[PDB]
Design a binder for this molecule. Sequence first.
Ligand SMILES: Nc1ncnc2c1ncn2[C@@H]1O[C@H](CSCC[C@H](N)C(=O)O)[C@@H](O)[C@H]1O
Ligand SMILES: NC1=NCCc2ccccc21
Length: 258
Amino acid sequence: GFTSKDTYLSHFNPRDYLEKYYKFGSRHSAESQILKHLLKNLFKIFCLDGVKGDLLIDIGSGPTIYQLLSACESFKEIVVTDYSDQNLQELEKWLKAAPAAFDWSPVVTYVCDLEGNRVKGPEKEEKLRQAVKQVLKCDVTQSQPLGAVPLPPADCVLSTLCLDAACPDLPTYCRALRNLGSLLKPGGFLVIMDALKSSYYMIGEQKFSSLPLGREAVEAAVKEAGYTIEWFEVISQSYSSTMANNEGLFSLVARKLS
Ligand SMILES: Nc1ncnc2c1ncn2[C@@H]1O[C@H](CSCC[C@H](N)C(=O)O)[C@@H](O)[C@H]1O
Ligand SMILES: NC1=NCCc2ccccc21
């Protein structure tokens, strides 16, 4: 009763996802209100709080880079990961500054604004491109998410809008949190942002299953998985009716218990 893993390889259109959720158009859409809030939290986590280190692993990056714009100010290296090779190719297109890459300029500008206008768009983009060295395949459902590929234990593991889409049930969800912890150094940071109580999301006519969790189930799973929560925020803002049936989104910062 849940989207098969292999559907992500074939039917998740990276460009269409970017057009539908991250175009950041002139009209005050629900998608843009969500994106602005996620950016505020990411700015607060990486620039205001002490979330820093040599390595940050982004889990289930999809074709997006918005979740890394503040992070590149605090981590020497950022490793981007996704189950879809098609998604990693779209990421790589932006990373190499190709002309057919997605235009992130209204999002890049917004981040520079948030950060105190210390830098401009081109300088911001360059710091991120220099931070990303590895573009890897990952599967959160596996005990070794990065498979046979080795990495030093991360200082931080970030995952935006991935676990609800990747986990068919609550046992898999708690298991995936434990699997992300195996990529984390003891006492390392876990940053998760996702939808609340969503049973699906859409990319045009293409439907994708989502695990509908309430904030209590998310908190319980993080505790069961061996983390300690530092903060937890719920926003009431949901996606447009045509996109998903969520009841807001959550953001949390936790630490791996040694
Ligand atoms: N088992 C799995 N392991 C890892 N990534 C998975 C996965 N199942 C789905 N995904 C990925 O999870 C993503 C959900 S969309 C979220 C994309 C991006 N992080 C953002 O914030 O918009 C897709 O890129 C999909 O390919
Ligand atoms: N992974 C997602 N990407 C787009 C928005 C969304 C809404 C609800 C559940 C999942 C998602």
